[PDB]
Amino acid sequence: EHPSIWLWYPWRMNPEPPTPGMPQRRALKNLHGAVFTDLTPVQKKRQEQMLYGINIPETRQMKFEQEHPLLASALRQLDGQPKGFPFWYKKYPTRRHAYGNRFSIPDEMLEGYGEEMKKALSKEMMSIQEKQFAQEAMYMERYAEHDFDTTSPAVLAVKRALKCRVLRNHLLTNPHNNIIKAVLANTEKKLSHALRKLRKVDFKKYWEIIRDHDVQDVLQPSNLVTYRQGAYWKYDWNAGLAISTNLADVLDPRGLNGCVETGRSRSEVARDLGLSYTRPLQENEKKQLSHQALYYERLAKFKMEQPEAARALERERFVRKFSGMFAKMDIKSGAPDFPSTYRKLLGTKVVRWASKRHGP
Amino acid sequence: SFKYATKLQHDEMRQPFYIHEKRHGIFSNEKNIRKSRRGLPFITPLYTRHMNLWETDTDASKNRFFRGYVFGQRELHQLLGRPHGFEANNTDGSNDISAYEMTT
Amino acid sequence: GQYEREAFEARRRLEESKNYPGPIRSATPGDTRFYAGSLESILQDNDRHYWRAVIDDPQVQYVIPLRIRFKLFTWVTTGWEQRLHIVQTMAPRDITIARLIELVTIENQSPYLCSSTFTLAVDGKELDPDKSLSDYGITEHSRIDAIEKLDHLLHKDSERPLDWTVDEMTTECLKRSPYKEMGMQPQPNLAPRYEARPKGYFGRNNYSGMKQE
Amino acid sequence: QTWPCTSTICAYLDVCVEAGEKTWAMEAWNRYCTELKFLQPGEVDPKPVSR
Amino acid sequence: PWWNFQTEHRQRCVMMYGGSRAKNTHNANHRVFIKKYKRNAFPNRTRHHWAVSMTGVLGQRPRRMPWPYDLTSLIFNQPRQGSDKIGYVVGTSMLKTAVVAANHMVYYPKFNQRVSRTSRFFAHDEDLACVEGDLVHIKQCRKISKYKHYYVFSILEPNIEGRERLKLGLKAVPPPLFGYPVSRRIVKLN
Amino acid sequence: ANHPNRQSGIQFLTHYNTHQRFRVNKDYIDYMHWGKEQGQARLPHRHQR
Amino acid sequence: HRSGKARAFVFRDPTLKMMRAGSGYQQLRRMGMPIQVSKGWRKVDHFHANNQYQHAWPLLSHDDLGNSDQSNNTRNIMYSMYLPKRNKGTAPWFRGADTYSVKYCEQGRYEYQRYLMINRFPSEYRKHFMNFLSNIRSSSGPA
Amino acid sequence: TRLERNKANGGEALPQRRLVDLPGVERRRDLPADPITRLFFQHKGDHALYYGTYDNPSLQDEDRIQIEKREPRYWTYNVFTPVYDFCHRIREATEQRKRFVIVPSTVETRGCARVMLGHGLVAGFRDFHNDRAFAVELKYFQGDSTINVIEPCAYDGKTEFEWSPKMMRRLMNTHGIHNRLVVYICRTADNRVIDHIQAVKENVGGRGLIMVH
Amino acid sequence: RWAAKFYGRVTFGPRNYPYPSSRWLARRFKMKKHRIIKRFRFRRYKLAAVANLPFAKMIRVGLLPELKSSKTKKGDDVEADLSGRLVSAVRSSGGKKKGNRGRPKSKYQI
Amino acid sequence: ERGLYFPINHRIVDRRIASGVTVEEADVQSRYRRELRTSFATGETRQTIPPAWSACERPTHFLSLRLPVRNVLRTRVNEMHNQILFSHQQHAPLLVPLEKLHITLGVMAISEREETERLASIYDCVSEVFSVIHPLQLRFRGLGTFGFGRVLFIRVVPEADFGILETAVSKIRRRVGGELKVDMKGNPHDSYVPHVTIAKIRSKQQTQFGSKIPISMWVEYQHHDFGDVTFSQVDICSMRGSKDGYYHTEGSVHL
RNA sequence: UAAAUUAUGGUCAAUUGUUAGUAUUCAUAUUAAUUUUUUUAAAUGUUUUAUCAUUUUAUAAAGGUUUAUUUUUGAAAGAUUUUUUGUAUAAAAUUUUAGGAAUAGUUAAUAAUAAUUUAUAAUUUUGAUUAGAUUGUUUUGUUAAUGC
């Protein structure tokens, strides 16, 4: 009913609770400090896609076929039968890729053994650590360059994205485990510090990541104090990604540069070659520009059929060009920021301005 | 070092006049002499220097200030994709050349 | 002139040659909008704010900066004066003088000068509003004058401005075009303050091209 | 070490004319205004500015 | 003269042979602070004043100083300092206007060390290309408004992620989660 | 050093990422039992020197 | 003294103390780092004239400027007294023409001068170009 | 330079062909190092594509510990460097009467070591090409270390102390007695690491690295 | 915490004094702190700070005329709505409630 | 009272006025904030300028990328036309039909006395360039002005494939210009701005409709996003649309 | 990962307190001062000109400022027989106070526009606006010396 008030008593250690003591469960903020009372629907679907057990997609099967057709042909003749030689090892290039079952038990090994053994080592009895790690390997499988690289930006970003999801799902279930607060916080700082090289090496994967793990809050800058002077941007610099661009293959590098002899800008060499470097402008930047595009039609439709009003505002402005403050042009007159060029004269004499500074 | 060496009223402890001429074109302090508010506190900043010092002309191989890893060269290398290392094999602060220059 | 004549000669020869490939537009530099100095200065049409030591191609000038020398009644606070008022209009090369004068009408920012319909002239003889600029030979140099519908009357003294230095400003003058705003009786600030030329500025007689005294 | 363009060779050559020393001009000829060839009937007259 | 000893002084007019003529100003004077307020009554709000100030600029201490030898002078030769500046274009929301945030060099002689410093500039960009983040080159000119003496002289990397973020429609950069630092416990619930 | 957990002292001759052996978050030294083989429970073991 | 200033367990090396002082204001000065923003010092006809001592004038013994300079000839008075010094009491510093290194005389002309690549704004190139043009065509008006 | 003008006279008049020799005699040997009683194997030169860097090392010498880097945390800390840690490795070992130290390996760390060894402050050193470490065998005398003191020029890394050639000439001048006693290691502009004595015999000054004596 | 744990440099001995603070100085500063705590507990010191105030500029509730202990002094000027909040809450801290998280309930609270 | 005193918007000093003239002789008052307006504020798309002779002759053959069926450019252009009309009944007779839509990547003055033989060698140069190229995806975003406002067109942006496309079209420009001495408009070395003309003022309407299309009619779309589209065919076409709507297909190349 | 010298090459770095268990720039010293001594200052009426006019002669009173102060030949030097030109306001680096937060004729584009044009505007914790002290960037003092 009013701002909550704690009654601090100085003789004591620290205050009493509020009389509108609003919360009960401490609310769990992000890496940089904003709430979530639960994860997005993407991430709850990614919990049901983690606790039902991920099956190895058929992409590995088909790549094994059109890749090693001889091991597949061997398997093609050997389908179903108790195998005494591993004709799938090249299909599972590492312990971890065999996440479709338990203990890295590749599918084509359990044929002859009991159906009950096949039930024992299937996706149904995987431990919860097993299932989390299974999703982890599957994703680090489809985002990595070569199946041994686990230190690629996309590799690391996706791995820590799943990682921070399981962390948040842990927390939004159990609240007072604050070593795990400092688990999720630092882990997310690194996932951001990896995605902010991903979206600098190839953003396509970056957005597939964005829209499949629904984490934009760990890129979203926190404090304007920083991102006013561009420090949340300096990071992709500091890592060394100021030039990981390939404009020669996205943005035609011809006009993106001024000249040295002329001194003219990017858009003016783009003028003197006829190319259109300009972002998508929002509706505001569109309407301000359409309005700035019609001022001369306004002048032509103004002076021509109401040259009375043309003359009326002639009188208005023609008196004003002589009235007012100044009439000649001195540096004192037209120093292009009077209030701050002249500090000694703002509180006493020139009470037009209430502060000595309004711009950079 | 010593006092008489800090006393800038000798000239030997000063960089001479003719270097503002060698910088801003010979006899270009005169067009500032002939100025209006010249003398009250400020004058036209007279650019007498050693020439081996200009931020303009010199390079990392001339100006002992340019190869300062702490903030200059470190950002240079984080920009130029070089391996920047504290006590690096290349004197400026670079461990070796970058992918771009390596190739091109 | 040794430049207008010769640049016209060569501007003409350039199209007196069909074996000419066109200009390499990436190599035909424009002008820079940002430069050293202080002002947003405009140089010529053929000139660049930077150094471009080339002798670039002499191109045809599509829109001419036409200069029309109006007549603005000024008020030094010692009488009304006749002084030069050029309004340099950027006008194309294909336009009829009718539309040119429509253009100047839209272009001026002092409607002290477009109250009544006026006409053009060059060394006197009027231009018709049915032909165009090259129909007479209007360059940017055509030493043009402008003539109002009441120019043949300004030696006269009926419409001549009734100034408070030598004439009676009635109340009805105090609701008419210049005088409602001219500021007769000095405010604490003298509100619209105008120029001031002495009654003894030029000497005993007025301003002439030839030596009188 | 500068390359006297056609205009500049013409200029200095006038100077040799007036002073009356053939040697003075023979070297400008030997050095610069040798690769100057007349406009052969097929080729463009004022080849455009390029750089 | 300065190099002479008090009692060996004779004549404070001339310097006989050579040396440095200068007025031995009196640095040793016990400048003071006359308390004209009470520790709970100050007509300032943020920074209270309670002891003498050290005054000057290019004289304060720690003796910060101008240093041109930075990223800018490593990359570009300049005619006059500050001409060319490279930064993360941050802030362009003023139509056709960019804010380029690029650093200079602040050298501390006493310590023998540097710190380059930040500055949100104004930078004209006719035709509205740059997005927040394009590493850009910025050059100086004739002024462009009250506050923009610069213009976007190139791009060094366009934020291709951002340009596509606009093309798709979203904000080319999400906005900071929190504001500037305040002093009031703003209780946001639900 | 008379602070506890600063008795480990300045060991530059370890391998750890620090010289201040009390700031090495790595191998907290058991104090009562070690030292039978290395001098004192500070110094690194004779299989890591 | 948990709240006292720190004291070195041992004096620092004075050589290191010197070597850390090749990059402080009092050597930036005599490198040339500052841009003189004001008159600086009082050059001429203020009380403190500098430029008349800036070059070398022989010893003026015209009257008693204090030490009976005009009949007292001052061999030892010059060493102890008027030859400037490195600080109060230090030895007479002699800026003589024999206390400069003999490589200074053996130089050819203008060799100290290094190729100075100076770049100026584009428009500023144009300005100075038109100016030295105007001034090769005509420097002074009629003369 | 004078001991070669009359040692390189052996040029025949003909610019003769250069003789082909065995498959390899011009390859640099490796320095001997016993493989079984050892600190690290003197890694071969052929594996020159197996060597990583000080910051990012390879996987070699699994039998042995690995030195770690020295990179602080905040603003409030001084930023150490291999030159600092090598000086205090050596200081603590000469204070503990060790024999071999396993000392960080950067170009100017072994720079300092090769000149200290030239100046006799060290019984020897060895670069096993171990991307990270290399071993300095210390010399003793009368019970006390020959490296009496050894200091870094900077207890910080963020503060590089370029030495003027005059600074470095006022060390070898102790009150009129020429004194090459205390040896100072400075890394010039040529990416060489030299003592102040050869630095001022060629009048170039370098980054300050260490003082030692 | 808004409280000051040490009212005084209790730890002051010679550096390396292998303890936080000698028992002497600890007793000296526990006497300073007993004076401070009895001053507060006996003038019935009450402070307060509510949301959307500048939380650094504390509220002196014990300096309110509805809860004043002095008679010749004037406590403080406080807006009426905030006063009706605070002093009602001070009355509210006069008892601890069974059916909630309990609290330390002192005489000097009332 | 709400800004600077002597704004730099109006701070101007024109130097095609002699010296002293504005001082003490004469006033030159004009409107300089329209001669100092930028191509970004007008629409001047710096088209490759043909010289005298090649400007005197009409475009005879023209290289064009063909639009596929079921486009996005077509549909957004359709709504642009709906709004052109609902804005003005005046401007329907200026718009280019939807079927005349193409993508212009070069015009060329071809003589009929050596017509088909030159067309064949040109076809060689076109196929020998676009053979190894992949199908091309381009960006349409924001219109511009050809003929000083005479032509309104949806330029293809340089932001997806203008690099490859312009290596290609400057190659074939060099080939058709310096190899087989055909008349492409400009220099053999220039790069013709590929363009999608959406409306135009033709000499047969100059008299009645003007020499500058009314920037009010279209300027709401001067910076509109018209779409990113893929295309597979570069065709040399002879300039006769009335064949079947799309200009006479004098040669095609699939990608 | 080589010693080398045709032998001091390139011009002076050098710290002087009688303390009082011990930790710690901290009373008494010396240097520069100030306290302290009349060998540097000083006067009124500017001056011409054809005349109740006009030509000539432009940064010391304070005024309180820390995102701050910047600008030319057209005057004059200045030379001939006449109409004679394109070089200027912009900046850039550095800015104080124990307990530190909101400030405002506003920012940009149009503009030789809008006392009611367009807008997601601009300053700020990289310490803003208010208020406080304060004259802003080759002049000293001490010190062997970064400093102070």
Side-chain angles (χ1 to χ4, degrees), chain C residues 15 20-21 62, chain J residues 48-59 109 183-186:
Chain C
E15 304 142 305
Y20 182 94
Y62 292 75
Chain J
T48 329
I49 298 310
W53 53 282
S54 170
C56 176
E57 301 108 17
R58 307 308 307 260
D183 180 42
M184 281 293 236
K185 289 323 178 196

Side-chain angles (χ1 to χ4, degrees), chain G residues 42-105:
Chain G
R42 311 292 307 229
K43 314 200 158 29
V44 271
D45 212 45
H46 183 81
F47 178 35
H48 305 293
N50 312 265
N51 318 42
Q52 36 157 351
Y53 323 119
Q54 280 240 352
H55 48 285
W57 255 86
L59 198 51
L60 285 210
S61 70
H62 63 263
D63 87 313
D64 288 33
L65 306 99
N67 289 100
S68 285
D69 305 46
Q70 41 76 25
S71 197
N72 180 22
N73 205 344
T74 33
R75 188 152 88 159
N76 306 276
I77 299 87
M78 226 43 46
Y79 300 129
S80 29
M81 189 153 205
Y82 294 148
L83 261 51
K85 288 197 301 250
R86 329 153 60 230
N87 199 328
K88 296 212 221 71
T90 43
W93 164 44
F94 320 86
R95 357 181 191 162
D98 86 322
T99 112
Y100 267 93
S101 100
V102 210
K103 306 202 189 224
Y104 269 117
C105 295

Side-chain angles (χ1 to χ4, degrees), chain C residues 51, chain G residues 127-141:
Chain C
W51 196 248
Chain G
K127 306 314 142 290
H128 301 292
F129 285 144
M130 311 168 144
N131 296 11
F132 314 116
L133 190 41
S134 323
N135 306 145
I136 47 199
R137 300 241 204 68
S138 63
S139 47
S140 88

Side-chain angles (χ1 to χ4, degrees), chain C residues 25 124 173:
Chain C
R25 45 191 211 97
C173 265

Side-chain angles (χ1 to χ4, degrees), chain I residues 11-75:
Chain I
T11 88
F12 158 68
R15 261 156 178 160
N16 282 341
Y17 178 66
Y19 277 103
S21 64
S22 70
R23 277 187 193 177
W24 189 249
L25 254 208
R27 241 171 283 101
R28 291 264 275 255
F29 291 120
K30 134 208 190 177
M31 295 148 19
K32 169 191 220 161
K33 195 164 178 157
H34 203 12
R35 289 186 77 263
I36 296 150
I37 295 286
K38 249 178 56 221
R39 164 139 45 256
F40 290 166
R41 209 182 226 255
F42 278 164
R43 283 88 177 275
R44 265 207 301 131
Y45 243 91
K46 284 178 197 156
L47 279 162
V50 71
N52 287 78
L53 261 186
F55 215 99
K57 199 166 62 134
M58 41 294 285
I59 288 199
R60 298 175 279 176
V61 154
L63 284 195
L64 254 53
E66 293 81 296
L67 295 177
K68 251 180 59 176
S69 181
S70 158
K71 294 305 153 197
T72 188
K73 295 204 183 187
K74 194 216 73 60

Side-chain angles (χ1 to χ4, degrees), chain C residues 17 19-22 24 27 52 54, chain D residues 42-46 48-51:
Chain C
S17 293
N19 186 9
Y20 182 94
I24 334 178
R52 197 67 196 173
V54 295
Chain D
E43 65 161 281
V44 44
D45 314 330
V49 325
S50 38
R51 162 190 43 105

Side-chain angles (χ1 to χ4, degrees), chain J residues 121-141:
Chain J
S121 38
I122 272 152
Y123 187 76
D124 282 1
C125 316
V126 159
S127 278
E128 206 207 6
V129 162
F130 299 92
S131 293
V132 315
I133 197 158
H134 299 67
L136 301 174
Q137 42 202 22
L138 284 204
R139 314 185 188 271
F140 310 124
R141 190 182 78 253

Side-chain angles (χ1 to χ4, degrees), chain A residues 250-252 271-272 274-276 278 281 286 289 292-293 296-297 299 325 328-329 334 336 338 352, chain J residues 1 3-6 8 11 31 33-34 37 39-40 46 141 155 157-159 162 216 219 223-224:
Chain A
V250 170
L251 284 147
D252 191 16
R271 147 200 104 187
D272 274 282
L275 324 159
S276 43
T278 300
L281 333 175
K286 269 182 173 192
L289 284 171
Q292 290 189 38
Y296 287 86
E297 262 164 4
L299 197 61
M325 292 281 184
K328 65 199 139 311
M329 208 188 158
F338 208 103
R352 181 191 161 188
Chain J
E1 202 193 347
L4 194 48
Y5 287 157
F6 280 46
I8 1 212
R11 267 217 196 187
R31 289 196 191 275
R33 291 248 69 109
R34 206 214 277 98
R37 198 182 235 212
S39 56
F40 169 71
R46 173 114 181 242
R141 190 182 78 253
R155 198 200 292 90
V157 209
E159 289 160 32
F162 198 103
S216 159
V219 87
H223 281 301
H224 178 231

